[PDB]
Symmetry: T
Subunit: 68 residues, 12 copies
């Protein structure tokens, strides 16, 4: 058949960098979403506290296949 | 913990301007959503009728914290 | 009243071109969403197999009116 | 029939803010254009004099239906 | 000589897809503008009614040579 | 002479809307910068608390003439 | 292994519309290239002659897998 | 009063470079438009013939004050 | 009160990757700036020497609260 | 002399994150290209399998000096 | 060591074209700044008086190395 | 027939300005590519040495007709 996908936007966070934030966001998404297929980073930001990075914040679009 | 956020897109409307459209959209969003944290305006448009602005239409991304 | 809209993102697919992909995606969306009002194409991509287009993939934002 | 629209670009101005600049620009546009249907804000700028905003300047695309 | 061009923006519409909307818009443009040379699609949108595409709406920039 | 300008980026805030945030940011800028000439809005965001807008946050580029 | 891809840019053309231009460009690309995997449309333009579309011109990025 | 501006798009051309193309386009514009105030370059392109630049082509937005 | 922020642009560098470049840039910024609040990555580039990455170069906007 | 550069686009991949994908892509590029000088990340995407990141995919522009 | 750069934004002006505006802006910047390394043009605009270009205005980002 | 074009990216350089950089890049391209048809400037940058512009660097897309 011709599949249809849905694309949602999430932000993963971690003090431990860009990869960790990506992985953390996607891990949360996978808990309650099915048929995840791809992601696309929209932005990399972070929150600073006392001059240090408290959290990296990576905004992602996440695409998944819609069930019939 | 490391929080994960979800970002949805809504359009608020009002005949009474940009601020009123923002506030209206966000008020509707708050009724059913929880843990709203930020918004970002994507566009400001409007519908014209008889040469006057019938509604300002303000598209926003709205970020909220996901529950575990 | 002043209506509020929600805008989601979907990808329609078809081997039979851009229009067919748009129509297919929107047809799937219409099965489970109500009060669809507009769409906006975000991108036109496709997957190639053996040098031929296997599927056109058209990403759309789709706006609909929120119920009270 | 299948309508065709024309989209022009104007800048509305006012010392009294974004909404006033939008409304002012559109009011001028309505005097000499017919069948105005929508607008889209392109930018919000302003001119400063003696440290104060002398005019808000709101650039808009304005769409209208072409007559046959 | 060194030619100068003017670029206007129009929206073509059709229920019958992207190509039909492009062709329709350009056909209307050709009736009252001369020396049309090129177009560039700016966006592909559409209006939905009862879950179906009522009109594809294709916004184009259209360039033409200015007469002396 | 041929003037040179410098362009800085600031964020004005206010609970009372976009215009108030713009005006507040620019008022602060005017206290310590001279020869302010123009501004350009880069983004309109805000912070939400208990479902309400606590502050509108308007990011602006601000241009001023450099002294010799 | 971890694959590496190369992305080139081509323009397909046809008087017969967007899909035909895409297909034509990709067919030419396939003649000399191997392991084509995806495309992404960058722009849709066209050349006008005597008020009619002489060619649709569809610029695409085309990704393919690099051989070792 | 609060002035309203109109912004049109033109392309100036010259074999003799970017400045010459800008100046040429604007000179043509000035012949039939009044109260020209500013321009903004949108793109710099050119046509190549026998490996040489036949014309630089500079697309500009041109803003002018609307008369009452 | 209603706070005002200033946003500057810096480039952090490191041979040891994106996170290291971010952290390095921000560490330098913190030495001579106060009340750092957030950053936003603008670009990730790098310099190549003998086919290897000599430095990752991460351009960031950095926002901080202005003192009264 | 005045050097001329060529800029190509590649996608590096790795299951082990953004830096690893960058390094992998560039290592492949260096095998068959000479005088590599810089890169610029265009996008960070990835493929998901069973809810996990199978590969990070980092699209880069890569600039190199052309030989005479 | 790993250098950190700062990037500021300036506008150079000249009646004598794009190159002259660039050179003028950068010459002013060099008078008070140290370790200038690169620039990137952001926009080319100009002010028109009596139908002629009074000043070309070239906005640049200018990067320089921060001292320890 | 329906022609297909290929679009490559090059950077021309010169100490003598934007036009000279464009012309230099294109002259180098013409030595080893055939059927050059158009260019589009992507960016204007430069390298600064001792406070002066050592080279203007103009990145261009260059389109050419593919042979059968
Ligand atoms: C324009 C703007 C953008 C911001 N972006 C972020 C962000 O990306 N991540 C984040 O954690 N906080 C962000 N913030 C919140 C700030 O980091 C900070 O927590 C807030 O402004 C309060 O700071 P203050 O106590 O110095 O006033 C942003 C604030 C503003 C005004
Ligand atoms: C390209 C395009 C963009 C539009 N954008 C908006 C919009 O932002 N807000 C809105 O209310 N209507 C929008 N519309 C709908 C028009 O405002 C209008 O209601 C519709 O085209 C019917 O107008 P007509 O009766 O003159 O044909 C848009 C229509 C087109 C074709
Ligand atoms: C940067 C990038 C973008 C891609 N975009 C698409 C796409 O738009 N549509 C699609 O079906 N596949 C897309 N893919 C997946 C590829 O088409 C392909 O299926 C995958 O990379 C495996 O190809 P390979 O077996 O040659 O390694 C993309 C892959 C990469 C790396
Ligand atoms: C890059 C640039 C952008 C400008 N944008 C605006 C604008 O948006 N609105 C406006 O009224 N003036 C704008 N101006 C004009 C300035 O506000 C100002 O009136 C002009 O540069 C003269 O200022 P000076 O006397 O300090 O040299 C702009 C000028 C430059 C150089
Ligand atoms: C942000 C926005 C964008 C819109 N874009 C379009 C469009 O591209 N084409 C169109 O025909 N109508 C457009 N519309 C109008 C809607 O399709 C719809 O006709 C209008 O909002 C009334 O819908 P409702 O009766 O559900 O409130 C737009 C409306 C909004 C708010
Ligand atoms: C991607 C992102 C963007 C943000 N943008 C803003 C902003 O524009 N303004 C602001 O005040 N805070 C911004 N924040 C901070 C949030 O509003 C919020 O204060 C912070 O994430 C803590 O929320 P939590 O306690 O629900 O985890 C941003 C945060 C993230 C992750
Ligand atoms: C800014 C600009 C953009 C153009 N884009 C296209 C294009 O996308 N496709 C095309 O075939 N020709 C394009 N052209 C070429 C024109 O369509 C036309 O063939 C050329 O300008 C000569 O027209 P003239 O004889 O009216 O001067 C472009 C020309 C200019 C100046
Ligand atoms: C995607 C595209 C963009 C073009 N842009 C321009 C342009 O900016 N200026 C111009 O004079 N011609 C432009 N053209 C027209 C070409 O320069 C050329 O005149 C036309 O494609 C015929 O070339 P051919 O005889 O090699 O097929 C463009 C053509 C295409 C397909
Ligand atoms: C368009 C362009 C972009 C460049 N971007 C970067 C960069 O992001 N980081 C960097 O270290 N050098 C950058 N450079 C400098 C080059 O990496 C290189 O050091 C310089 O061009 C000299 O190289 P060559 O000796 O091969 O001529 C750039 C150069 C050009 C022309
Ligand atoms: C719009 C779109 C974008 C995609 N982007 C990527 C990508 O960046 N990387 C990738 O490996 N695959 C990409 N793909 C391919 C998907 O990840 C997936 O492999 C393909 O759609 C088949 O999934 P399905 O079996 O659930 O239908 C993309 C597909 C679509 C439709
Ligand atoms: C949207 C907008 C953009 C402008 N951009 C520029 C600019 O780039 N450079 C400049 O010198 N002036 C700029 N101006 C100022 C105008 O050129 C002009 O000096 C001002 O609007 C007063 O013109 P008027 O007397 O016709 O009302 C801009 C004005 C507006 C409204
Ligand atoms: C973010 C970034 C962008 C750069 N862009 C350019 C460029 O466009 N052209 C160029 O010649 N060099 C470019 N460079 C290289 C610098 O001009 C400079 O040669 C290099 O960073 C070494 O400078 P330093 O000795 O002060 O550390 C860039 C460097 C960075 C970090
Ligand atoms: Cl959503
Ligand atoms: Cl127009
Ligand atoms: Cl290439
Ligand atoms: Cl600054």
């Amino acid at each position: 058949s011709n599949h249809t996908y849905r694309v949602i936007e999430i932000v993963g966070t971690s003090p431990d960098g860009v990869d960790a934030a990506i992985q953390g966001g996607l891990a949360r998404a996978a808990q309650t979403m099915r048929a995840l297929d791809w992601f696309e980073v929209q932005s990399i930001r972070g929150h600073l506290v006392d001059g240090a990075v408290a959290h990296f914040q990576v905004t992602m679009k996440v695409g998944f296949r819609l069930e019939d």
